[PDB]
Amino acid sequence: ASEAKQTVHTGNTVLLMIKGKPVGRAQSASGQREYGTTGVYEIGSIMPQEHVYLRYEGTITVERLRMKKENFADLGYASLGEEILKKDIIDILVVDNLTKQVIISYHGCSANNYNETWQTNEIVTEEIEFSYLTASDKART
């Protein structure tokens, strides 16, 4: 039996896709958003009379195991030097394994920092952190 009213997402029901290509052996991803809320304090009140949105900052991180082929450097998505200046924006999509419907998409993603670890006793891993213009959860049912 399978009652959809209580289902949740997991690692086996999600795909990470770039330019249609599913990135392989991807391990984890985290998303952050900051609206920069600030309160307004009058003289005759310790309490904040109201809150206001001021600034939108958002970053997304991706952890991956470096495949011998189609690594982020080979794919051209990342960069290692002045080649970065010629790299255009990208959109990173999280799409449902079952229906292939979209769960959340990040628009105008741009790379922030690049990390790779070479270790003796463990598989090679690399991490990338992007900064995006806007997020979207459209194209739903």
Binding site: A4, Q6, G11, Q101
Partner: protein, 275 residues
Amino acid sequence: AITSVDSYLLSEIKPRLNTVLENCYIIDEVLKDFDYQTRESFKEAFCGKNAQHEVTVGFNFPKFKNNYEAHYLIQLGQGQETKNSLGSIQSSYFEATGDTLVESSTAIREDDKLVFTVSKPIGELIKVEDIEFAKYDNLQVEGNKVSFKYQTNEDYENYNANIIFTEKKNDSKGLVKGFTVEEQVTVVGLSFNVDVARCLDAVLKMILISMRDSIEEQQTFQLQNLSFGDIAPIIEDGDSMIFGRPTIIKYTSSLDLDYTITQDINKLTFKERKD
């Protein structure tokens, strides 16, 4: 929705195992790494539509004799509770809903709308294959059938679509109370020939891989983990030993119960007071 992992395993294994053993190409793909001898012997014995020998699957402690040439043996194993929500609340529903169904349905013409018919009524429509209805199409569900505007879509009068939907049970509303359970189930293949056991284990692994695309365990039995034991002689008291390699499968499911609510507000009595 109480979960019976063993019955689900049996129902998934039997037709899928039969289909996999039906054809030789899939088996050759599976047994690529094995040597020629064992591969071809297993193919001769079990593979093919016209195979004389056949595998079987069943639960443990059967009172009857069970075939030990090649058999899949299941036993329930342990279980544990791992996570909970506040008040044991899992979800809230306005309309009682049963299982999630997938049905193929060819498009049909109605005087104002193209429609798809379905076997049973609809509680909620999840997805229609390769379609993203816009406002112009004005997607509407009316019990058994789903419908969209005829005129601008008239090229697709016979679209061979398929539908993922959910059954409708009642119009009542309630709360879902339950928790998550982390369960372990043991599966072992039996054979007096060790090579047959090895090939059987490989086939088991492949069908477990294939199952991950199934709707039910995508919705109910997420977080599948596997663990394999050592090849051991299951029995020594017979004329010849039984050899089997137990495997442990883990799953996470949400045991839950629907608690109905009879309270429905339809009127308001806003009145002041005097002193």
